[PDB]
């Protein structure tokens, strides 16, 4: 989707800096992260049912650019986008698919880092 929205409030916070410089950075370096770097390409991957099932696509490249563009008002909003990305993967793919295991390992790290996020100040 959009990396900026003229009608949506956005700002800088120390927590959003943490999302950018700790959470995004830590997940990007993981070997399981590459399926999430860019929007799902239903044509290249021949997934003619992907956009029939997933209505609100999300990916880590979009989250990263949103952080750089001050799209978010709060860290919780950026966390919600991470959640949309992982939840889409669980909703669409087969329960036994490799990508589901990849999503699970990344989401565990996501939640661990969120648990350590500095208090908003």
């Amino acid at each position: 989707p959009e990396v900026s929205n003229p009608s949506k409030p956005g700002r800088k916070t120390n927590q959003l800096q943490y999302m950018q410089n700790v959470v995004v950075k830590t997940l990007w370096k993981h070997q399981f992260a590459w399926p999430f770097y860019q929007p799902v390409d239903a044509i290249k991957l021949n997934l003619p049912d992907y956009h029939k099932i997933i209505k609100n696509p999300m990916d880590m490249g979009t989250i990263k650019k949103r952080l750089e563009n001050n799209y978010y008002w709060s860290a919780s909003e950026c966390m919600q986008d991470f959640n949309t990305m992982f939840t889409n993967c669980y909703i669409y793919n087969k329960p036994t698919d490799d990508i589901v295991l990849m999503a699970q390992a990344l989401e565990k790290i996501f939640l661990q880092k969120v648990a350590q996020m500095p208090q908003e100040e």
Binding site: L45, D97, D98, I99, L101
Partner: peptide, 9 residues
């Protein structure tokens, strides 16, 4: 559902 195939995990 079609799904994305193996990713060598």
């Amino acid at each position: 559902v079609i799904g994305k195939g193996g990713k060598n995990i």
